[PDB]
């Protein structure tokens, strides 16, 4: 069995009511909703010990819950929730107060206006000559910039194969306009390979960035391309 | 002297689609102090003693929230037990639960209780050690294994030995003129508490009656 | 009911043995430990019920205090794969878990050959500060138009080689590598190409 929360990323303009899904086939009587702010702990929102009963956590204002079925415990984010952007986590336990099993989490980002949504611009930076001669290693730098929300998943691909060794994505994005509340983001990753590997022109290194943005249903009225969920890539081939 | 605080829950299923009954009653000794009925408009834990009426709305709010959780738990239990015993949906069935604590003359924890009965027969009970369970039958062995693996006895011991005793002490102090009262059988008439050495009957004035 | 976790942050070295604490004044009937990676669901590590009880999972050793008011999390020969937020939780009287605020553990790699250097990469250009020891901290930028990342650990497992690095860049055409990591406490043996 298991605990699921779909989707991984949720996007909404301020003022919209939103339902966060939570399902479990573990035959657990109790379910919980928490929220977590970046670099912070868990905060209890709402909880249910048994079907047809729920009770407020420590941060229940502007949220609503339902427990009609043992298996689901939907969380509604209402317009009355003052600070709605958070990482939301659901959990279940056999009986209340026992060990909890957490779902994968949903990142909900709530925006002032949809015209603040931008896809990333992806660029690959070829290794430094001095690095190659000084260490006999070659670092490739990837740079995803100007995306909003920070609903991205970056991956490195060498000869069509996804690589994890020699890779290092930043744990957190970076604001481009720190003073702006809905500031766009930037994110870098590094791929370090042997100087002979970079030197080989049969080698192809590509940087994939999946972005989660506007959905089919959303209204776009702007001149620029509707910033929908998409993949933006950048590549470089090996040089001698 | 020795005092006790007890909670008695009955839950009765009704034929077919009829929702079940639920009665919650609370006692400090031989004096009932709270009630919650399923077939009542109030849908609230209600005082049944004068001394408990002095409690704030927060108390009554919590006691209502906690009983509606117990009620929903016993409603599920009725459905579970029907299955455990492979029974039909037309025949009426009863689930009974009791929990509480006894304190001695020093008002310190004496003993704890936590037991269930199904259709008038004992089903499962926390033993006097408050660590282990008495499962009457093969159906109740499914319960015991669930409660063991989920460490229920440890949490129940915590409430019975502590919380339960603290509440009993708060009620005894608040209900000073009512609960600490000792009467005084007439030769056995109008005595309190009920324990004496035909069945002891309530006079309905707070005291009891007995016949030689 | 309250759970206090100590320390809030621990930054140790790969190989080191460490201990994290979780205390209360109240007895808990059962206690749990979790490990959480950012933006991922917490993974339950253990459930402790008996006071004095010691359990082992992977490179972790848990101990439930005798009175059941505290617990510890010991990591033997820490790996950079032990990085994360460690959370203790305990049985709540009202049908929930009582959570501690956590311990953020960073297991830094042992850089055996510290060769600090600032390099320039071509596409728009980026400044790469790499091969510096796990004791050097990358300081944040002074200008809005200048962006500087935090330190990230890289693992070339086939060559058994690990490295730390930061990426800095600016919109400015007049921006250079020598004046890129000005805020940071750059080591002396830092390599700079003309």
């Amino acid at each position: 069995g298991g605990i699921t929360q779909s989707p991984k990323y949720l996007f909404r303009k301020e003022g919209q009511n939103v339902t966060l899904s939570c399902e479990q086939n573990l035959n657990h009587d109790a379910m919980y909703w928490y929220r977590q702010d970046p670099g912070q702990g868990l905060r209890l929102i709402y909880y249910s010990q048994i079907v047809n009963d729920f009770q407020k956590g420590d941060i229940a204002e502007g949220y609503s819950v339902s427990r009609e079925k043992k298996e689901s415990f939907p969380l509604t984010v209402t317009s009355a929730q003052k600070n709605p952007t958070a990482f939301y986590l659901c959990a279940s336990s056999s009986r209340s107060s026992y060990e909890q099993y957490f779902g994968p989490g949903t990142r909900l980002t709530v925006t002032e206006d949809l015209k603040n949504v931008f896809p990333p611009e992806v660029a690959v930076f070829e290794p430094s000559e001095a690095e190659i001669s000084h260490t006999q290693k070659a670092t490739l730098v990837c740079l995803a910039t100007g995306f909003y929300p920070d609903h991205v998943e970056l991956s490195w691909w060498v000869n069509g194969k996804e690589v994890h060794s020699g890779v290092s994505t930043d744990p957190q994005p970076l604001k481009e306009q720190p003073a702006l509340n809905d500031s766009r983001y930037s994110l870098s990753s590094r791929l370090r390979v042997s100087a002979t590997f970079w030197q080989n022109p049969r080698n192809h290194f590509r940087c994939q960035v999946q972005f989660y943005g506007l959905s089919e249903n959303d209204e776009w009225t702007q001149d620029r391309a509707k910033p929908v969920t998409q993949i933006v890539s950048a590549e470089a081939w090996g040089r001698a | 002297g020795s005092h006790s605080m007890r909670y008695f829950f009955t839950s009765v299923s009704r034929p077919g689609r009829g929702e079940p009954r639920f009665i919650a009653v609370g006692y400090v000794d031989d004096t009932q102090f709270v009630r919650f009925d399923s077939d009542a408009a109030s849908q609230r834990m209600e005082p049944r003693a004068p001394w408990i009426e002095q409690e704030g709305p927060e108390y009554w709010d919590g006691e209502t929230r906690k009983v509606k959780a117990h009620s929903q738990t016993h409603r599920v239990d009725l459905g579970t037990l029907r299955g455990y015993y492979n029974q039909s949906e037309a025949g009426s069935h009863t689930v009974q639960r009791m929990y509480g604590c006894d304190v001695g003359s020093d008002w310190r924890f004496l003993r704890g209780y936590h037991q269930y009965a199904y259709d008038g027969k004992d089903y499962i009970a926390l033993k006097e050690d408050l660590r282990s369970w008495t499962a009457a039958d093969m159906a109740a062995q499914t319960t015991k294994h669930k409660w063991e693996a989920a460490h229920v006895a440890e949490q129940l011991r915590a409430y019975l030995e502590g919380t339960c005793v603290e509440w009993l002490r708060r009620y005894l102090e608040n209900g000073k003129e009512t609960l600490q009262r000792t009467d005084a059988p007439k030769t056995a008439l109008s005595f309190y508490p009920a324990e004496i050495t035909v069945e002891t009957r309530p006079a309905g004035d707070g005291t009891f009656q007995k016949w030689a | 009911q309250l759970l206090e976790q100590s320390p809030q942050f621990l930054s140790i070295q790969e190989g080191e043995n460490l201990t994290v604490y979780c205390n209360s004044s109240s007895v808990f009937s059962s206690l749990q430990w979790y490990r959480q990676e950012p933006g991922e669901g917490p993974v339950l590590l253990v459930t402790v019920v008996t006071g004095g009880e010691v359990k082992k999972l992977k490179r972790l050793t848990f101990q439930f205090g005798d009175a059941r008011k505290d617990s510890s999390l010991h990591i033997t020969a820490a790996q950079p794969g032990d990085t994360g937020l460690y959370l203790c939780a305990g049985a709540g009287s009202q049908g929930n878990l009582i959570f501690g605020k956590g311990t953020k553990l960073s297991v830094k790699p042992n850089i055996q050959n510290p060769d600090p250097a600032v390099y320039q990469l071509r596409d728009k250009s980026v400044c790469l500060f790499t091969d510096f020891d796990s004791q050097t901290n990358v300081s944040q930028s002074k200008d809005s138009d200048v962006y500087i990342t935090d330190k990230t650990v890289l693992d070339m497992r086939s060559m058994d080689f690990k490295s730390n690095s930061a990426v800095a860049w600016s919109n400015k055409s007049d921006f250079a590598c020598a004046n890129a990591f000005n805020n940071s406490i750059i080591p002396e043996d830092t390599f700079f190409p003309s």
Binding site: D29, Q49, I50, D53, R95, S96, S97 | Y7, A24, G26, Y59, G62, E63, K66, V67, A69, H70, Q72, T73, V76, D77, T80, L81, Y99, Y116, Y123, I124, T143, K146, W147, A150, V152, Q155, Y159, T163, W167 | G92, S93, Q94, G95
Partner: peptide
């Protein structure tokens, strides 16, 4: 007061 904790049999 009653238990703040509930569990099914």
């Amino acid at each position: 007061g009653i238990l703040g904790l509930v569990f099914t049999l």
